[PDB]
């Protein structure tokens, strides 16, 4: 009959999917070996509870995001290093920007952030945040004397 698979399963389906098998398979393979569970009203729900909960946790994730989309892309950032024409007297790793955005208009997030190496020249920059999948924030940053 119908079962809810706990794991990915070859030619049946992805975990959580509900597939229809012969009861012999279910009862002597799937159920014993924690591979799938019977599709009863009582855990047909636990399917949807997990679903609903998943949807909402992502909803807030696209909420406190949309905060960090309007509040960000809506300011700037100077850097109080020194500069002898070009190239910086200190140098800003994103860990600085971390604590740095956490400084001026301050602010705080958690790095990552696109600074594959730390900032060695000066000038006009706009660094790729991405707090959450499919939600881009370009962010204005200036490096000044």
């Amino acid at each position: 009959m119908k079962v809810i698979l706990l794991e990915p399963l070859e030619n049946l389906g992805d975990v959580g999917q509900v597939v229809d098998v012969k009861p012999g398979y279910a009862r002597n393979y799937l159920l014993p070996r924690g591979l799938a569970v019977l599709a009863t009203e009582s855990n047909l729900k636990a399917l949807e509870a997990r679903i609903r909960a998943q949807a909402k946790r992502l909803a807030e994730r696209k909420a406190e995001a949309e905060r960090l989309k309007e509040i960000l892309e809506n300011l700037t950032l100077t850097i109080p290093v020194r500069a002898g024409e070009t190239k910086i007297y200190g140098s800003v790793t994103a860990k600085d920007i971390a604590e740095a955005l956490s400084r001026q208009h301050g602010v705080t997030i958690e790095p990552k952030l696109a600074l594959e190496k730390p900032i060695k020249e000066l000038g006009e920059y706009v660094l790729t945040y991405k707090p959450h999948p499919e939600v881009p924030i370009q962010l204005k940053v200036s490096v000044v004397a």
Partner: peptide, 11 residues
């Protein structure tokens, strides 16, 4: 009644 066994377990 074999599935009744399995309903018990789950319960």
């Amino acid at each position: 009644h074999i599935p009744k066994v399995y309903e018990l377990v789950e319960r």
